[PDB]
Amino acid sequence: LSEEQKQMIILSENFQRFVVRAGRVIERALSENVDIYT
């Protein structure tokens, strides 16, 4: 909710490593939907 808090999370190891998971999962979908070689 609050401001300073969003910050605390953004710099956690909960989030730092979740963002990298989802990240990888997605980055496939992303390039199926789109021809990156064109």
Binding site: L1, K6, I9, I10, N14, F15, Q16, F18, V19, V20, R21, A22, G23, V25, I26, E27, A29, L30, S31, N33, V34, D35, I36
Partner: protein
């Protein structure tokens, strides 16, 4: 960092329009959209992700949804939900 350098690596994928992060509660954390809008998506998508995850759970309790994506005429929304956070990305397909 990898977080800021990844969250941005997505935002610039060919065809990406927006990107948002939420939590179990449906509260936007970081998000590349005007905030009044970023509210919409979080609320709805979180609901959608719940139902879906729940549907997946009722078809089978030993299963958990990993990834969901709804395609419209205009674009595709995806949503990777991961316990406490969920990443929404709107993309513009080609198709």
């Amino acid at each position: 960092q990898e977080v800021e350098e990844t969250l941005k690596r997505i935002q610039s994928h060919k065809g990406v329009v927006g990107t948002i992060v939420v939590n179990n509660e449906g509260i936007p954390v970081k998000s590349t959209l005007d905030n009044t809008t970023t509210v919409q998506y979080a609320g709805l998508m979180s609901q959608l992700a719940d139902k879906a995850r729940s549907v997946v759970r009722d078809l089978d309790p030993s299963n958990d949804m990993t990834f969901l994506r709804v395609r419209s005429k205009k674009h595709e929304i995806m949503v990777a939900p991961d316990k406490d956070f969920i990443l929404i990305v709107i993309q513009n397909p080609t198709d």
